[PDB]
Amino acid sequence: QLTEEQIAEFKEAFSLFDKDGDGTITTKELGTVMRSLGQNPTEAELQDMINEVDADGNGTIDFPEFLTMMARKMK
């Protein structure tokens, strides 16, 4: 029951991570967001966060993977 309004919200959230707009979230971009929240993750911790949702194993998160993750939390 994923609506177009929800996909638009999730795409906006994705864009907040995807700092350079290239369609993928990297550990560098994730680290930038975490440090702006006062967090202090290691590269290994960032790679762990990506791995949990990196469906195709290429080491970065694209929007299909991000949407899949948000849809799973909905159910």
């Binding site: 919200e9 999730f10 906006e12 959230a13 991570f17 993750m69 948000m70 909905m74």
Partner: peptide, 20 residues
């Protein structure tokens, strides 16, 4: 210990509300 979903709820609460 925070997941990508956890960080999304921090930086995009509307996405958060939809999930909950």
């Amino acid at each position: 210990n925070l997941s990508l979903f956890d960080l999304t709820t921090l930086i995009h609460p509307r996405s958060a509300a939809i999930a909950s």
